[PDB]
Amino acid sequence: KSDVKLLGAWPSPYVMRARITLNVKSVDYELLEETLGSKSDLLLKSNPVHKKIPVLIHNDKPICESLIIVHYIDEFWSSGPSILPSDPYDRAIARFWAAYLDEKWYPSLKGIASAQGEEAKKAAVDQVGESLALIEDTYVKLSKGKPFFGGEKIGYLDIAFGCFLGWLRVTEKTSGVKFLNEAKTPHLAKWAVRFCADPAVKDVMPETEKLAEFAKLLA
Amino acid sequence: KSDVKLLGAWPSPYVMRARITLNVKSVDYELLEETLGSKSDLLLKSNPVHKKIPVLIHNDKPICESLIIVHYIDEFWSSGPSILPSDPYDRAIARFWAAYLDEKWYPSLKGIASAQGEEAKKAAVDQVGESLALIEDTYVKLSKGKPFFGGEKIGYLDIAFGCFLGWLRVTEKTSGVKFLNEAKTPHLAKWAVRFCADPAVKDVMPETEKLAEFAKLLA
Ligand SMILES: N[C@@H](CCC(=O)N[C@@H](CS)C(=O)NCC(=O)O)C(=O)O
Ligand SMILES: N[C@@H](CCC(=O)N[C@@H](CS)C(=O)NCC(=O)O)C(=O)O
């Protein structure tokens, strides 16, 4: 906490990645919230390039990009539970789907709410459904019967994907489409319950209607 | 070569990342070229998600995304010269600037040639100049007097940035603006000569006018 500070905002899924990873490692830290609508001077100093949260400040050194932050926490506090797979190929696959979720899935998740002003543009709803099917079978292959993407304990892809679960449930209630359930994604449904109930996740996973209130609050 | 195949295209900077990393590790491999304009069925099978090159096929297992590929090669062939820094913070900084070059710099490099049809839209030229200044001082801080971003031998960020040098020189000749030279970027200029002349780079670094011919060939 004296040595570790996290620049972020409570409803941010990427900030949650750092929070979860820090909890897994039992690393204490000070949380500095960003008033959304404007950017703090500390965020500007700490991340002049992207001006984005989260920013992990460890011993007065900035570490930017959530996935890079997760890697860093795992590699520095190496004596704690590993966040990344031990095997090089498992590592590459882990990293691929995390990058996939940020480049493709999450923007397409935002795409359901967004559009223009015609009728039925939401092939976005179809694509989110397809992606979740891709993730469902990805889980089956990676988990191999074990409760998480990373086995016994939550891992890199658990954190990378599970950090979106709140915003997913927001999208579900508003769009009317339940993407993640027992019918469509049976394995992910069971995993989602366990992940959201994990001690390193449950308190930093924001309430759904609370997130929804923020979403509707957002201009 | 029997065990390692690289799906790509010769003028691709991201494919070059894999080629360079493989050379550093002295890992032999078969090269399968993509006819640009269409996508091979192997590329479609090997990368159904992004349908992008490069794809490293190691023991009939696909590894996608160049930076993930670089990580994988470094972590699998771990007995060879390290491509990533040993220190966790140096690792995070390495990864940040690599990600920066792909998200911000290279798209803004393509931005100089691209536009609409008015006059003088190229604040793109200014931004490429600014970014190179950011990279120049980044080099000074990371190299610490040593010839490369990674010290003695080329490293992660050497490969991540140096893979763009051919397309940079193409942009320079066409735009008329020399971005990387002794006046603007003195340290990068000296490094560029060494990197391009490194045995793991020199043969897979395409000729400039040859790249330019491809660029003008490209519709
Ligand atoms: N690639 C970045 C994404 C960061 C990001 O976009 N954060 C959003 C919300 S989670 C934000 O509020 N950024 C400040 C901004 O977008 O201007 C990461 O993984 O850290
Ligand atoms: N993020 C990807 C970028 C891959 C990429 O965009 N490759 C380009 C040229 S280097 C390409 O030809 N992709 C096939 C396509 O864009 O459709 C990586 O680092 O591998």
Side-chain angles (χ1 to χ4, degrees), chain A residues 49-50 71 75 91 95-96 100 103-104, chain B residues 49-50 71 75 88 91 95-96 100 103-104:
Chain A
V49 167
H50 292 127
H71 275 77
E75 286 172 348
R91 266 164 182 252
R95 290 157 173 169
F96 169 78
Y100 164 77
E103 195 195 40
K104 276 254 172 63
Chain B
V49 167
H50 292 127
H71 275 77
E75 286 172 348
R91 266 164 182 252
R95 290 157 173 169
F96 169 78
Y100 164 77
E103 195 195 40
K104 276 254 172 63

mmCIF file with all atom_site columns, all heavy atoms in Angstrom, chain A residues 49-50 71 75 91 95-96 100 103-104, chain B residues 49-50 71 75 88 91 95-96 100 103-104:
data_model
loop_
_atom_site.group_PDB
_atom_site.id
_atom_site.type_symbol
_atom_site.label_atom_id
_atom_site.label_alt_id
_atom_site.label_comp_id
_atom_site.label_asym_id
_atom_site.label_entity_id
_atom_site.label_seq_id
_atom_site.pdbx_PDB_ins_code
_atom_site.Cartn_x
_atom_site.Cartn_y
_atom_site.Cartn_z
_atom_site.occupancy
_atom_site.B_iso_or_equiv
_atom_site.pdbx_formal_charge
_atom_site.auth_seq_id
_atom_site.auth_comp_id
_atom_site.auth_asym_id
_atom_site.auth_atom_id
_atom_site.pdbx_PDB_model_num
ATOM 1   N N   . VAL A 1 49  ? 1.316   8.831   -22.386 1.00 0.00 ? 49  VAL A N   1
ATOM 2   C CA  . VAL A 1 49  ? 1.183   8.258   -23.719 1.00 0.00 ? 49  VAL A CA  1
ATOM 3   C C   . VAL A 1 49  ? -0.264  7.930   -24.082 1.00 0.00 ? 49  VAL A C   1
ATOM 4   O O   . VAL A 1 49  ? -0.764  8.363   -25.121 1.00 0.00 ? 49  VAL A O   1
ATOM 5   C CB  . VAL A 1 49  ? 2.036   6.982   -23.854 1.00 0.00 ? 49  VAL A CB  1
ATOM 6   C CG1 . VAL A 1 49  ? 1.666   6.225   -25.114 1.00 0.00 ? 49  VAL A CG1 1
ATOM 7   C CG2 . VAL A 1 49  ? 3.518   7.330   -23.839 1.00 0.00 ? 49  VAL A CG2 1
ATOM 8   N N   . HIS A 1 50  ? -0.934  7.166   -23.226 1.00 0.00 ? 50  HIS A N   1
ATOM 9   C CA  . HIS A 1 50  ? -2.298  6.725   -23.503 1.00 0.00 ? 50  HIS A CA  1
ATOM 10  C C   . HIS A 1 50  ? -3.331  7.497   -22.694 1.00 0.00 ? 50  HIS A C   1
ATOM 11  O O   . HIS A 1 50  ? -4.486  7.614   -23.106 1.00 0.00 ? 50  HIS A O   1
ATOM 12  C CB  . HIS A 1 50  ? -2.443  5.229   -23.218 1.00 0.00 ? 50  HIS A CB  1
ATOM 13  C CG  . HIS A 1 50  ? -1.686  4.358   -24.170 1.00 0.00 ? 50  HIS A CG  1
ATOM 14  N ND1 . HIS A 1 50  ? -0.804  3.386   -23.746 1.00 0.00 ? 50  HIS A ND1 1
ATOM 15  C CD2 . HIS A 1 50  ? -1.683  4.304   -25.522 1.00 0.00 ? 50  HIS A CD2 1
ATOM 16  C CE1 . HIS A 1 50  ? -0.286  2.777   -24.797 1.00 0.00 ? 50  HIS A CE1 1
ATOM 17  N NE2 . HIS A 1 50  ? -0.804  3.313   -25.888 1.00 0.00 ? 50  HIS A NE2 1
ATOM 18  N N   . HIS A 1 71  ? 0.789   -9.374  -15.928 1.00 0.00 ? 71  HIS A N   1
ATOM 19  C CA  . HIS A 1 71  ? 2.071   -10.046 -16.131 1.00 0.00 ? 71  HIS A CA  1
ATOM 20  C C   . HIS A 1 71  ? 3.096   -9.601  -15.097 1.00 0.00 ? 71  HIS A C   1
ATOM 21  O O   . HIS A 1 71  ? 3.791   -10.425 -14.503 1.00 0.00 ? 71  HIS A O   1
ATOM 22  C CB  . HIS A 1 71  ? 2.614   -9.770  -17.536 1.00 0.00 ? 71  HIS A CB  1
ATOM 23  C CG  . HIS A 1 71  ? 2.087   -10.699 -18.591 1.00 0.00 ? 71  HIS A CG  1
ATOM 24  N ND1 . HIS A 1 71  ? 0.817   -10.564 -19.125 1.00 0.00 ? 71  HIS A ND1 1
ATOM 25  C CD2 . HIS A 1 71  ? 2.653   -11.748 -19.210 1.00 0.00 ? 71  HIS A CD2 1
ATOM 26  C CE1 . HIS A 1 71  ? 0.635   -11.510 -20.029 1.00 0.00 ? 71  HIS A CE1 1
ATOM 27  N NE2 . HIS A 1 71  ? 1.724   -12.246 -20.104 1.00 0.00 ? 71  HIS A NE2 1
ATOM 28  N N   . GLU A 1 75  ? 4.994   -11.723 -12.212 1.00 0.00 ? 75  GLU A N   1
ATOM 29  C CA  . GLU A 1 75  ? 6.429   -11.937 -12.350 1.00 0.00 ? 75  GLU A CA  1
ATOM 30  C C   . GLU A 1 75  ? 7.227   -11.341 -11.192 1.00 0.00 ? 75  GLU A C   1
ATOM 31  O O   . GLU A 1 75  ? 8.274   -11.870 -10.823 1.00 0.00 ? 75  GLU A O   1
ATOM 32  C CB  . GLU A 1 75  ? 6.925   -11.363 -13.682 1.00 0.00 ? 75  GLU A CB  1
ATOM 33  C CG  . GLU A 1 75  ? 6.522   -12.195 -14.892 1.00 0.00 ? 75  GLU A CG  1
ATOM 34  C CD  . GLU A 1 75  ? 6.858   -11.522 -16.210 1.00 0.00 ? 75  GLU A CD  1
ATOM 35  O OE1 . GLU A 1 75  ? 7.189   -10.318 -16.199 1.00 0.00 ? 75  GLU A OE1 1
ATOM 36  O OE2 . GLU A 1 75  ? 6.795   -12.198 -17.258 1.00 0.00 ? 75  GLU A OE2 1
ATOM 37  N N   . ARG A 1 91  ? 0.742   -20.744 -22.167 1.00 0.00 ? 91  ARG A N   1
ATOM 38  C CA  . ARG A 1 91  ? 0.943   -19.309 -22.002 1.00 0.00 ? 91  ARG A CA  1
ATOM 39  C C   . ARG A 1 91  ? 0.484   -18.549 -23.242 1.00 0.00 ? 91  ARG A C   1
ATOM 40  O O   . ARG A 1 91  ? -0.259  -17.572 -23.142 1.00 0.00 ? 91  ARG A O   1
ATOM 41  C CB  . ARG A 1 91  ? 2.415   -19.003 -21.716 1.00 0.00 ? 91  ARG A CB  1
ATOM 42  C CG  . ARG A 1 91  ? 2.766   -18.914 -20.240 1.00 0.00 ? 91  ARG A CG  1
ATOM 43  C CD  . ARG A 1 91  ? 4.270   -18.990 -20.025 1.00 0.00 ? 91  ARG A CD  1
ATOM 44  N NE  . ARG A 1 91  ? 4.624   -18.965 -18.609 1.00 0.00 ? 91  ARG A NE  1
ATOM 45  C CZ  . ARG A 1 91  ? 5.197   -17.931 -18.000 1.00 0.00 ? 91  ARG A CZ  1
ATOM 46  N NH1 . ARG A 1 91  ? 5.492   -16.834 -18.686 1.00 0.00 ? 91  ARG A NH1 1
ATOM 47  N NH2 . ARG A 1 91  ? 5.483   -17.996 -16.707 1.00 0.00 ? 91  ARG A NH2 1
ATOM 48  N N   . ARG A 1 95  ? -2.601  -15.914 -23.534 1.00 0.00 ? 95  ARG A N   1
ATOM 49  C CA  . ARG A 1 95  ? -2.384  -14.547 -23.979 1.00 0.00 ? 95  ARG A CA  1
ATOM 50  C C   . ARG A 1 95  ? -3.194  -14.203 -25.224 1.00 0.00 ? 95  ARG A C   1
ATOM 51  O O   . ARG A 1 95  ? -3.649  -13.070 -25.380 1.00 0.00 ? 95  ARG A O   1
ATOM 52  C CB  . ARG A 1 95  ? -0.894  -14.315 -24.240 1.00 0.00 ? 95  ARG A CB  1
ATOM 53  C CG  . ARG A 1 95  ? -0.053  -14.284 -22.975 1.00 0.00 ? 95  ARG A CG  1
ATOM 54  C CD  . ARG A 1 95  ? 1.399   -14.615 -23.262 1.00 0.00 ? 95  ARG A CD  1
ATOM 55  N NE  . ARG A 1 95  ? 2.240   -14.433 -22.083 1.00 0.00 ? 95  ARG A NE  1
ATOM 56  C CZ  . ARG A 1 95  ? 3.503   -14.840 -21.994 1.00 0.00 ? 95  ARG A CZ  1
ATOM 57  N NH1 . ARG A 1 95  ? 4.074   -15.461 -23.015 1.00 0.00 ? 95  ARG A NH1 1
ATOM 58  N NH2 . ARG A 1 95  ? 4.191   -14.629 -20.881 1.00 0.00 ? 95  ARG A NH2 1
ATOM 59  N N   . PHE A 1 96  ? -3.371  -15.181 -26.108 1.00 0.00 ? 96  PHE A N   1
ATOM 60  C CA  . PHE A 1 96  ? -4.112  -14.963 -27.345 1.00 0.00 ? 96  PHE A CA  1
ATOM 61  C C   . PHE A 1 96  ? -5.566  -14.595 -27.078 1.00 0.00 ? 96  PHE A C   1
ATOM 62  O O   . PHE A 1 96  ? -6.088  -13.640 -27.653 1.00 0.00 ? 96  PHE A O   1
ATOM 63  C CB  . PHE A 1 96  ? -4.053  -16.202 -28.241 1.00 0.00 ? 96  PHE A CB  1
ATOM 64  C CG  . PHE A 1 96  ? -5.002  -16.150 -29.406 1.00 0.00 ? 96  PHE A CG  1
ATOM 65  C CD1 . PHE A 1 96  ? -4.705  -15.389 -30.525 1.00 0.00 ? 96  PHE A CD1 1
ATOM 66  C CD2 . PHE A 1 96  ? -6.193  -16.860 -29.382 1.00 0.00 ? 96  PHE A CD2 1
ATOM 67  C CE1 . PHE A 1 96  ? -5.577  -15.336 -31.598 1.00 0.00 ? 96  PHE A CE1 1
ATOM 68  C CE2 . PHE A 1 96  ? -7.068  -16.810 -30.452 1.00 0.00 ? 96  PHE A CE2 1
ATOM 69  C CZ  . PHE A 1 96  ? -6.759  -16.047 -31.561 1.00 0.00 ? 96  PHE A CZ  1
ATOM 70  N N   . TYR A 1 100 ? -7.623  -11.316 -27.613 1.00 0.00 ? 100 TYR A N   1
ATOM 71  C CA  . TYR A 1 100 ? -8.826  -11.447 -28.427 1.00 0.00 ? 100 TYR A CA  1
ATOM 72  C C   . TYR A 1 100 ? -10.010 -10.730 -27.791 1.00 0.00 ? 100 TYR A C   1
ATOM 73  O O   . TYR A 1 100 ? -10.792 -10.072 -28.477 1.00 0.00 ? 100 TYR A O   1
ATOM 74  C CB  . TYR A 1 100 ? -9.167  -12.923 -28.644 1.00 0.00 ? 100 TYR A CB  1
ATOM 75  C CG  . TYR A 1 100 ? -10.575 -13.158 -29.141 1.00 0.00 ? 100 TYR A CG  1
ATOM 76  C CD1 . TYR A 1 100 ? -10.906 -12.939 -30.470 1.00 0.00 ? 100 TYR A CD1 1
ATOM 77  C CD2 . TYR A 1 100 ? -11.573 -13.605 -28.284 1.00 0.00 ? 100 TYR A CD2 1
ATOM 78  C CE1 . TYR A 1 100 ? -12.189 -13.154 -30.934 1.00 0.00 ? 100 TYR A CE1 1
ATOM 79  C CE2 . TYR A 1 100 ? -12.860 -13.823 -28.738 1.00 0.00 ? 100 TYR A CE2 1
ATOM 80  C CZ  . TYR A 1 100 ? -13.161 -13.595 -30.064 1.00 0.00 ? 100 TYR A CZ  1
ATOM 81  O OH  . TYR A 1 100 ? -14.439 -13.809 -30.527 1.00 0.00 ? 100 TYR A OH  1
ATOM 82  N N   . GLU A 1 103 ? -9.388  -6.861  -28.210 1.00 0.00 ? 103 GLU A N   1
ATOM 83  C CA  . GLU A 1 103 ? -9.409  -6.349  -29.576 1.00 0.00 ? 103 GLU A CA  1
ATOM 84  C C   . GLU A 1 103 ? -10.759 -6.571  -30.252 1.00 0.00 ? 103 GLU A C   1
ATOM 85  O O   . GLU A 1 103 ? -11.242 -5.708  -30.984 1.00 0.00 ? 103 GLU A O   1
ATOM 86  C CB  . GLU A 1 103 ? -8.304  -6.994  -30.417 1.00 0.00 ? 103 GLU A CB  1
ATOM 87  C CG  . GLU A 1 103 ? -8.029  -6.262  -31.724 1.00 0.00 ? 103 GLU A CG  1
ATOM 88  C CD  . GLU A 1 103 ? -7.209  -7.083  -32.698 1.00 0.00 ? 103 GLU A CD  1
ATOM 89  O OE1 . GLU A 1 103 ? -7.451  -8.305  -32.798 1.00 0.00 ? 103 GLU A OE1 1
ATOM 90  O OE2 . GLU A 1 103 ? -6.325  -6.507  -33.366 1.00 0.00 ? 103 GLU A OE2 1
ATOM 91  N N   . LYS A 1 104 ? -11.366 -7.727  -30.002 1.00 0.00 ? 104 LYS A N   1
ATOM 92  C CA  . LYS A 1 104 ? -12.575 -8.115  -30.721 1.00 0.00 ? 104 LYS A CA  1
ATOM 93  C C   . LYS A 1 104 ? -13.835 -8.174  -29.858 1.00 0.00 ? 104 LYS A C   1
ATOM 94  O O   . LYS A 1 104 ? -14.816 -7.490  -30.148 1.00 0.00 ? 104 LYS A O   1
ATOM 95  C CB  . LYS A 1 104 ? -12.366 -9.471  -31.400 1.00 0.00 ? 104 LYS A CB  1
ATOM 96  C CG  . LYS A 1 104 ? -11.672 -9.387  -32.749 1.00 0.00 ? 104 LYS A CG  1
ATOM 97  C CD  . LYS A 1 104 ? -12.660 -9.622  -33.883 1.00 0.00 ? 104 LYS A CD  1
ATOM 98  C CE  . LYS A 1 104 ? -12.031 -9.339  -35.236 1.00 0.00 ? 104 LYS A CE  1
ATOM 99  N NZ  . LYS A 1 104 ? -10.895 -10.256 -35.524 1.00 0.00 ? 104 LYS A NZ  1
ATOM 100 N N   . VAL B 1 49  ? -9.824  -17.091 -36.207 1.00 0.00 ? 49  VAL B N   1
ATOM 101 C CA  . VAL B 1 49  ? -10.308 -15.955 -35.435 1.00 0.00 ? 49  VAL B CA  1
ATOM 102 C C   . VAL B 1 49  ? -9.970  -14.612 -36.080 1.00 0.00 ? 49  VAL B C   1
ATOM 103 O O   . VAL B 1 49  ? -10.852 -13.780 -36.298 1.00 0.00 ? 49  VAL B O   1
ATOM 104 C CB  . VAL B 1 49  ? -9.736  -15.982 -34.004 1.00 0.00 ? 49  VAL B CB  1
ATOM 105 C CG1 . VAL B 1 49  ? -9.984  -14.659 -33.306 1.00 0.00 ? 49  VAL B CG1 1
ATOM 106 C CG2 . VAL B 1 49  ? -10.334 -17.138 -33.215 1.00 0.00 ? 49  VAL B CG2 1
ATOM 107 N N   . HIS B 1 50  ? -8.694  -14.402 -36.384 1.00 0.00 ? 50  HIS B N   1
ATOM 108 C CA  . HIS B 1 50  ? -8.240  -13.129 -36.936 1.00 0.00 ? 50  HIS B CA  1
ATOM 109 C C   . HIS B 1 50  ? -7.960  -13.212 -38.430 1.00 0.00 ? 50  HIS B C   1
ATOM 110 O O   . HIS B 1 50  ? -8.035  -12.205 -39.135 1.00 0.00 ? 50  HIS B O   1
ATOM 111 C CB  . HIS B 1 50  ? -6.982  -12.651 -36.208 1.00 0.00 ? 50  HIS B CB  1
ATOM 112 C CG  . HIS B 1 50  ? -7.223  -12.252 -34.786 1.00 0.00 ? 50  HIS B CG  1
ATOM 113 N ND1 . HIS B 1 50  ? -6.486  -12.761 -33.738 1.00 0.00 ? 50  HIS B ND1 1
ATOM 114 C CD2 . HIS B 1 50  ? -8.110  -11.390 -34.239 1.00 0.00 ? 50  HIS B CD2 1
ATOM 115 C CE1 . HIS B 1 50  ? -6.914  -12.234 -32.606 1.00 0.00 ? 50  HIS B CE1 1
ATOM 116 N NE2 . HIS B 1 50  ? -7.898  -11.396 -32.881 1.00 0.00 ? 50  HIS B NE2 1
ATOM 117 N N   . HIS B 1 71  ? 7.220   -13.992 -27.644 1.00 0.00 ? 71  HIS B N   1
ATOM 118 C CA  . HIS B 1 71  ? 7.223   -14.496 -26.272 1.00 0.00 ? 71  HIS B CA  1
ATOM 119 C C   . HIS B 1 71  ? 7.368   -16.012 -26.242 1.00 0.00 ? 71  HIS B C   1
ATOM 120 O O   . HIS B 1 71  ? 8.166   -16.553 -25.478 1.00 0.00 ? 71  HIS B O   1
ATOM 121 C CB  . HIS B 1 71  ? 5.938   -14.094 -25.541 1.00 0.00 ? 71  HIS B CB  1
ATOM 122 C CG  . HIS B 1 71  ? 5.988   -12.729 -24.922 1.00 0.00 ? 71  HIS B CG  1
ATOM 123 N ND1 . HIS B 1 71  ? 5.846   -11.573 -25.670 1.00 0.00 ? 71  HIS B ND1 1
ATOM 124 C CD2 . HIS B 1 71  ? 6.145   -12.340 -23.645 1.00 0.00 ? 71  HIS B CD2 1
ATOM 125 C CE1 . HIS B 1 71  ? 5.924   -10.532 -24.861 1.00 0.00 ? 71  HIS B CE1 1
ATOM 126 N NE2 . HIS B 1 71  ? 6.107   -10.958 -23.630 1.00 0.00 ? 71  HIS B NE2 1
ATOM 127 N N   . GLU B 1 75  ? 10.323  -18.328 -24.714 1.00 0.00 ? 75  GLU B N   1
ATOM 128 C CA  . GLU B 1 75  ? 10.017  -19.148 -23.548 1.00 0.00 ? 75  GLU B CA  1
ATOM 129 C C   . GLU B 1 75  ? 10.200  -20.640 -23.815 1.00 0.00 ? 75  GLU B C   1
ATOM 130 O O   . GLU B 1 75  ? 10.554  -21.394 -22.909 1.00 0.00 ? 75  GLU B O   1
ATOM 131 C CB  . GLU B 1 75  ? 8.591   -18.870 -23.064 1.00 0.00 ? 75  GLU B CB  1
ATOM 132 C CG  . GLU B 1 75  ? 8.436   -17.528 -22.360 1.00 0.00 ? 75  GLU B CG  1
ATOM 133 C CD  . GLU B 1 75  ? 6.990   -17.186 -22.051 1.00 0.00 ? 75  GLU B CD  1
ATOM 134 O OE1 . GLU B 1 75  ? 6.088   -17.868 -22.581 1.00 0.00 ? 75  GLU B OE1 1
ATOM 135 O OE2 . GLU B 1 75  ? 6.755   -16.237 -21.275 1.00 0.00 ? 75  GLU B OE2 1
ATOM 136 N N   . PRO B 1 88  ? 11.547  -7.931  -14.143 1.00 0.00 ? 88  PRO B N   1
ATOM 137 C CA  . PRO B 1 88  ? 10.097  -7.752  -14.278 1.00 0.00 ? 88  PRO B CA  1
ATOM 138 C C   . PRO B 1 88  ? 9.694   -6.350  -14.729 1.00 0.00 ? 88  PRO B C   1
ATOM 139 O O   . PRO B 1 88  ? 8.811   -6.224  -15.577 1.00 0.00 ? 88  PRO B O   1
ATOM 140 C CB  . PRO B 1 88  ? 9.580   -8.032  -12.864 1.00 0.00 ? 88  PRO B CB  1
ATOM 141 C CG  . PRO B 1 88  ? 10.585  -8.952  -12.282 1.00 0.00 ? 88  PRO B CG  1
ATOM 142 C CD  . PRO B 1 88  ? 11.907  -8.505  -12.834 1.00 0.00 ? 88  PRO B CD  1
ATOM 143 N N   . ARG B 1 91  ? 10.780  -5.836  -18.210 1.00 0.00 ? 91  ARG B N   1
ATOM 144 C CA  . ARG B 1 91  ? 9.856   -6.610  -19.031 1.00 0.00 ? 91  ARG B CA  1
ATOM 145 C C   . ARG B 1 91  ? 8.602   -5.804  -19.350 1.00 0.00 ? 91  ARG B C   1
ATOM 146 O O   . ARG B 1 91  ? 8.185   -5.719  -20.505 1.00 0.00 ? 91  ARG B O   1
ATOM 147 C CB  . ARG B 1 91  ? 9.475   -7.914  -18.326 1.00 0.00 ? 91  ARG B CB  1
ATOM 148 C CG  . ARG B 1 91  ? 10.334  -9.110  -18.702 1.00 0.00 ? 91  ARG B CG  1
ATOM 149 C CD  . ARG B 1 91  ? 10.158  -10.249 -17.708 1.00 0.00 ? 91  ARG B CD  1
ATOM 150 N NE  . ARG B 1 91  ? 11.019  -11.386 -18.019 1.00 0.00 ? 91  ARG B NE  1
ATOM 151 C CZ  . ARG B 1 91  ? 10.583  -12.544 -18.504 1.00 0.00 ? 91  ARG B CZ  1
ATOM 152 N NH1 . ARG B 1 91  ? 9.288   -12.726 -18.728 1.00 0.00 ? 91  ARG B NH1 1
ATOM 153 N NH2 . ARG B 1 91  ? 11.439  -13.524 -18.759 1.00 0.00 ? 91  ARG B NH2 1
ATOM 154 N N   . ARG B 1 95  ? 7.362   -4.482  -22.992 1.00 0.00 ? 95  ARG B N   1
ATOM 155 C CA  . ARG B 1 95  ? 6.065   -4.862  -23.529 1.00 0.00 ? 95  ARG B CA  1
ATOM 156 C C   . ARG B 1 95  ? 5.180   -3.656  -23.825 1.00 0.00 ? 95  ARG B C   1
ATOM 157 O O   . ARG B 1 95  ? 4.409   -3.667  -24.784 1.00 0.00 ? 95  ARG B O   1
ATOM 158 C CB  . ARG B 1 95  ? 5.356   -5.808  -22.558 1.00 0.00 ? 95  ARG B CB  1
ATOM 159 C CG  . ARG B 1 95  ? 5.989   -7.187  -22.482 1.00 0.00 ? 95  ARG B CG  1
ATOM 160 C CD  . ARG B 1 95  ? 5.659   -7.883  -21.174 1.00 0.00 ? 95  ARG B CD  1
ATOM 161 N NE  . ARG B 1 95  ? 6.130   -9.264  -21.161 1.00 0.00 ? 95  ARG B NE  1
ATOM 162 C CZ  . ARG B 1 95  ? 6.155   -10.036 -20.079 1.00 0.00 ? 95  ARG B CZ  1
ATOM 163 N NH1 . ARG B 1 95  ? 5.742   -9.558  -18.913 1.00 0.00 ? 95  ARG B NH1 1
ATOM 164 N NH2 . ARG B 1 95  ? 6.599   -11.282 -20.162 1.00 0.00 ? 95  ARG B NH2 1
ATOM 165 N N   . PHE B 1 96  ? 5.293   -2.618  -23.000 1.00 0.00 ? 96  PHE B N   1
ATOM 166 C CA  . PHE B 1 96  ? 4.482   -1.418  -23.173 1.00 0.00 ? 96  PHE B CA  1
ATOM 167 C C   . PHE B 1 96  ? 4.774   -0.723  -24.497 1.00 0.00 ? 96  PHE B C   1
ATOM 168 O O   . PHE B 1 96  ? 3.856   -0.361  -25.232 1.00 0.00 ? 96  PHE B O   1
ATOM 169 C CB  . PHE B 1 96  ? 4.707   -0.439  -22.019 1.00 0.00 ? 96  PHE B CB  1
ATOM 170 C CG  . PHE B 1 96  ? 4.112   0.922   -22.258 1.00 0.00 ? 96  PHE B CG  1
ATOM 171 C CD1 . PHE B 1 96  ? 2.751   1.134   -22.107 1.00 0.00 ? 96  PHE B CD1 1
ATOM 172 C CD2 . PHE B 1 96  ? 4.913   1.988   -22.637 1.00 0.00 ? 96  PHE B CD2 1
ATOM 173 C CE1 . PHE B 1 96  ? 2.199   2.383   -22.329 1.00 0.00 ? 96  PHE B CE1 1
ATOM 174 C CE2 . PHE B 1 96  ? 4.366   3.239   -22.861 1.00 0.00 ? 96  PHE B CE2 1
ATOM 175 C CZ  . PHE B 1 96  ? 3.008   3.436   -22.706 1.00 0.00 ? 96  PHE B CZ  1
ATOM 176 N N   . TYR B 1 100 ? 2.670   -0.196  -27.747 1.00 0.00 ? 100 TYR B N   1
ATOM 177 C CA  . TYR B 1 100 ? 2.503   1.187   -28.178 1.00 0.00 ? 100 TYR B CA  1
ATOM 178 C C   . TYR B 1 100 ? 2.740   1.337   -29.675 1.00 0.00 ? 100 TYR B C   1
ATOM 179 O O   . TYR B 1 100 ? 2.015   2.058   -30.360 1.00 0.00 ? 100 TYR B O   1
ATOM 180 C CB  . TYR B 1 100 ? 3.454   2.106   -27.407 1.00 0.00 ? 100 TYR B CB  1
ATOM 181 C CG  . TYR B 1 100 ? 3.626   3.471   -28.033 1.00 0.00 ? 100 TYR B CG  1
ATOM 182 C CD1 . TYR B 1 100 ? 2.651   4.447   -27.892 1.00 0.00 ? 100 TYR B CD1 1
ATOM 183 C CD2 . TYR B 1 100 ? 4.768   3.787   -28.760 1.00 0.00 ? 100 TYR B CD2 1
ATOM 184 C CE1 . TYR B 1 100 ? 2.801   5.697   -28.458 1.00 0.00 ? 100 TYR B CE1 1
ATOM 185 C CE2 . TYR B 1 100 ? 4.928   5.036   -29.331 1.00 0.00 ? 100 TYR B CE2 1
ATOM 186 C CZ  . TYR B 1 100 ? 3.941   5.986   -29.176 1.00 0.00 ? 100 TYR B CZ  1
ATOM 187 O OH  . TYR B 1 100 ? 4.090   7.232   -29.740 1.00 0.00 ? 100 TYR B OH  1
ATOM 188 N N   . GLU B 1 103 ? -0.358  -0.268  -31.509 1.00 0.00 ? 103 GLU B N   1
ATOM 189 C CA  . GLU B 1 103 ? -1.637  0.410   -31.325 1.00 0.00 ? 103 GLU B CA  1
ATOM 190 C C   . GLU B 1 103 ? -1.610  1.841   -31.852 1.00 0.00 ? 103 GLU B C   1
ATOM 191 O O   . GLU B 1 103 ? -2.582  2.310   -32.443 1.00 0.00 ? 103 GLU B O   1
ATOM 192 C CB  . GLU B 1 103 ? -2.044  0.416   -29.849 1.00 0.00 ? 103 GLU B CB  1
ATOM 193 C CG  . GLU B 1 103 ? -3.507  0.771   -29.623 1.00 0.00 ? 103 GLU B CG  1
ATOM 194 C CD  . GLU B 1 103 ? -3.813  1.122   -28.181 1.00 0.00 ? 103 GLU B CD  1
ATOM 195 O OE1 . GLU B 1 103 ? -2.982  1.804   -27.545 1.00 0.00 ? 103 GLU B OE1 1
ATOM 196 O OE2 . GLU B 1 103 ? -4.885  0.717   -27.684 1.00 0.00 ? 103 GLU B OE2 1
ATOM 197 N N   . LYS B 1 104 ? -0.494  2.532   -31.639 1.00 0.00 ? 104 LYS B N   1
ATOM 198 C CA  . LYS B 1 104 ? -0.417  3.956   -31.950 1.00 0.00 ? 104 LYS B CA  1
ATOM 199 C C   . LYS B 1 104 ? 0.526   4.304   -33.100 1.00 0.00 ? 104 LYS B C   1
ATOM 200 O O   . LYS B 1 104 ? 0.103   4.904   -34.088 1.00 0.00 ? 104 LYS B O   1
ATOM 201 C CB  . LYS B 1 104 ? -0.002  4.740   -30.703 1.00 0.00 ? 104 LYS B CB  1
ATOM 202 C CG  . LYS B 1 104 ? -1.154  5.075   -29.770 1.00 0.00 ? 104 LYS B CG  1
ATOM 203 C CD  . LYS B 1 104 ? -1.520  6.549   -29.868 1.00 0.00 ? 104 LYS B CD  1
ATOM 204 C CE  . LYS B 1 104 ? -2.795  6.857   -29.102 1.00 0.00 ? 104 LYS B CE  1
ATOM 205 N NZ  . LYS B 1 104 ? -2.645  6.598   -27.645 1.00 0.00 ? 104 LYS B NZ  1
#
